[PDB]
Design an enzyme around this catalytic site. Sequence first.
Site, PDB file in Angstrom:
ATOM      1  NE  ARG A   1      -1.645  -1.015   4.045  1.00  0.00           N
ATOM      2  CZ  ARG A   1      -1.319   0.118   4.655  1.00  0.00           C
ATOM      3  NH1 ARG A   1      -1.812   1.271   4.224  1.00  0.00           N
ATOM      4  NH2 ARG A   1      -0.496   0.103   5.694  1.00  0.00           N
TER       5      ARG A   1
ATOM      6  CE1 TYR B   1       0.926  -6.071  -1.264  1.00  0.00           C
ATOM      7  CE2 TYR B   1      -0.527  -4.227  -0.810  1.00  0.00           C
ATOM      8  CZ  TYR B   1       0.161  -5.339  -0.381  1.00  0.00           C
ATOM      9  OH  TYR B   1       0.081  -5.719   0.939  1.00  0.00           O
ATOM     10  N   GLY B   2      -2.197  -6.176  -4.001  1.00  0.00           N
ATOM     11  CA  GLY B   2      -3.464  -6.497  -3.363  1.00  0.00           C
ATOM     12  C   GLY B   2      -4.219  -5.425  -2.596  1.00  0.00           C
ATOM     13  N   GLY B   3      -3.522  -4.689  -1.739  1.00  0.00           N
ATOM     14  CA  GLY B   3      -4.158  -3.645  -0.956  1.00  0.00           C
ATOM     15  C   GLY B   3      -4.613  -2.489  -1.823  1.00  0.00           C
TER      16      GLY B   3
ATOM     17  CE  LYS C   1      -6.066  -4.057   4.707  1.00  0.00           C
ATOM     18  NZ  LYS C   1      -6.297  -4.336   6.150  1.00  0.00           N
TER      19      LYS C   1
ATOM     20  CG  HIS D   1      -6.959  -3.172  10.263  1.00  0.00           C
ATOM     21  ND1 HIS D   1      -5.670  -2.736  10.480  1.00  0.00           N
ATOM     22  CD2 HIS D   1      -6.867  -4.187   9.373  1.00  0.00           C
ATOM     23  CE1 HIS D   1      -4.834  -3.458   9.756  1.00  0.00           C
ATOM     24  NE2 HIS D   1      -5.536  -4.346   9.074  1.00  0.00           N
TER      25      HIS D   1
ATOM     26  CB  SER E   1       2.580  -3.170  10.227  1.00  0.00           C
ATOM     27  OG  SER E   1       2.353  -1.779  10.356  1.00  0.00           O
ATOM     28  CB  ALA E   2       4.583  -7.032  12.228  1.00  0.00           C
ATOM     29  CB  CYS E   3       1.033  -6.580  15.628  1.00  0.00           C
ATOM     30  SG  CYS E   3       1.795  -5.065  16.250  1.00  0.00           S
ATOM     31  N   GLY E   4       1.388  -9.878  14.413  1.00  0.00           N
ATOM     32  CA  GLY E   4       0.746 -11.179  14.376  1.00  0.00           C
ATOM     33  C   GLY E   4      -0.774 -11.227  14.407  1.00  0.00           C
TER      34      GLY E   4
ATOM     35  CG  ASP F   1      -7.196  -7.435   7.072  1.00  0.00           C
ATOM     36  OD1 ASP F   1      -6.296  -6.992   7.817  1.00  0.00           O
ATOM     37  OD2 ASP F   1      -7.460  -6.813   6.022  1.00  0.00           O
TER      38      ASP F   1
ATOM     39  NE  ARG G   1       0.641  -8.659   2.509  1.00  0.00           N
ATOM     40  CZ  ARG G   1       0.050  -8.072   3.538  1.00  0.00           C
ATOM     41  NH1 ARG G   1      -1.019  -8.623   4.095  1.00  0.00           N
ATOM     42  NH2 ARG G   1       0.528  -6.931   4.012  1.00  0.00           N
TER      43      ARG G   1
ATOM     44  NE  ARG H   1       5.419  -6.534  15.001  1.00  0.00           N
ATOM     45  CZ  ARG H   1       6.270  -7.473  14.605  1.00  0.00           C
ATOM     46  NH1 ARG H   1       7.574  -7.299  14.762  1.00  0.00           N
ATOM     47  NH2 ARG H   1       5.818  -8.589  14.045  1.00  0.00           N
TER      48      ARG H   1
ATOM     49  CG  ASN I   1       0.504 -14.446  22.587  1.00  0.00           C
ATOM     50  OD1 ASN I   1       1.357 -14.249  23.453  1.00  0.00           O
ATOM     51  ND2 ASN I   1       0.652 -14.040  21.332  1.00  0.00           N
TER      52      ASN I   1
END
Length: 603
Positions: free
Chosen positions: A78, A226-228, A235, A255, A277-280, A302, A396, A427, A516
């Site tokens: 994005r 790109y997908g996004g 999105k 989100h 973003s990351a953060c799993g 998502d 991805r 994070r 977790n």
Amino acid sequence: NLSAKVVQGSLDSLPQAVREFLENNAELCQPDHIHICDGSEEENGRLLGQMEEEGILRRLKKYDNCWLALTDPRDVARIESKTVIVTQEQRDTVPIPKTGLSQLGRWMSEEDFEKAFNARFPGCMKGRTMYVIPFSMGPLGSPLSKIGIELTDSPYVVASMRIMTRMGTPVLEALGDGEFVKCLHSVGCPLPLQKPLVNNWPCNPELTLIAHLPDRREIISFGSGYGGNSLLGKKCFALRMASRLAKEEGWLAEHMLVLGITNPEGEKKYLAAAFPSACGKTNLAMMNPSLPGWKVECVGDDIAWMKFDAQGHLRAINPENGFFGVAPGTSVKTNPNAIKTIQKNTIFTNVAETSDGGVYWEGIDEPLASGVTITSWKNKEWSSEDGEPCAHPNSRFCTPASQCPIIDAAWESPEGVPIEGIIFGGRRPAGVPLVYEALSWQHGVFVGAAMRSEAKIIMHDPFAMRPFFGYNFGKYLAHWLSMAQHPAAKLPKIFHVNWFRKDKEGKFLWPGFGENSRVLEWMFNRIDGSTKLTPIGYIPKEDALNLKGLGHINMMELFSISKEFWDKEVEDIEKYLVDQVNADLPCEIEREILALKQRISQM
Ligand SMILES: [Mn+2]
């Protein structure tokens, strides 16, 4: 005239509105051909084979029907700078900040947009086929679902849409003469190619622009594949446009991942979580929990659409039909359910390829057999010694949700699932405890509003929605606040987590992944009604967190709350919210800022 460029399906078979939309952009984009997608496996097979022929996709023979797309390195994610929302008044799109430029969205005048549009789309699809994609966001035929029509000159977009949404003839059947979201996409490279084509992947980075026109129910995307930027239901539509719609109709577009967790006594609850973003995100959504007798099931990883039901329960539904997951970092250990989901009918974008036709990426943690080599995502031979990753960090996998082994039995229930807990995160290497609970709904709203995350930079990411706000964040905050006044609302408990706290040597204090589940356990029991009060909210009291079976944990440092750190925290939060939200900052938020400040002062 037009009917003659149709290579699949029938103009007369389309509802008039759909047809009129098709006619207008075909005449505008001047495509050589019109393909009305039907969404059948047969069509998918055709599009894939063609894609193989043109060299847009490669077949991955290690697996059952898996493919690989490699892109132009200039089109891999994005682009926030090139993402805009178009409204008569700026105020309606973003708050006017006190200083600098808004970090809460990018606004463009109707006037500037027409100019930008006129410079891009006329004749953009010449030499190419225009695909017509009928798609449903949310379970097919549900009256609560939204239908869209996406015109694209990218077969890659088509194949991906087939996975990420309900797509094809049955969608058109359900639409009838109903309203739909108009989605126009184009890679921006009319034939003959005026510029060099990289990896057979058409893109136009210079003129890349992803626009949203809410008043018109239109999404207009140019120059990126790109997908996004190209999967318009995701999105652009399910988050941005939807958050605006929802704000007007009592519901919410977030989100958020959605999961169903079951304790050893058979009691089940659904939680939603907003992570940057990351953060799993995906790792939590389909977690294999370490705690004996527990069970986690995935609804979505998502997007979540939520609306209070007649009894005041916040109902969530996943309007997506699949997972567009980040691949690097994915392994049996970190996310076994994800590995399993993607063994089949999956499209990979920008990962590496082993010589046996398998996939590869950083942290796949899967040793190569004797003599297996790696072709990196730039189509070059690769070794650990080259100084660049074998897969793009934003690479991805695009996979059908129905293949996840723990997909929730209610992931497509038109009634939706009752959320009892909302989880915010980020994070944060320092200062923020592993898990804390908000003191009230108002405070919880402020918590989401205070979200920050280390992208070595730590940035603000309110509700993990920074790049996705469909309208004034100030107003978004008011909307969220108003929920406490909805009649007989059963407000979900709000928590904030952090899996990434480090010790001075930068080593993680918490193992995470399956573990977790232990944190999830604490949340679950709290919803059922124990806590230790702290200035920032409730943390688990001593020995409440279940540590059975873990090596040693530095609980003291994991839950440590320093005045020095939190002094600078609320200071930074106040400055951010006041400056960025300005005249639109709800007074309830003002009160939480000051209240947190006060609480921190008496320590
Ligand atoms: Mn996302």
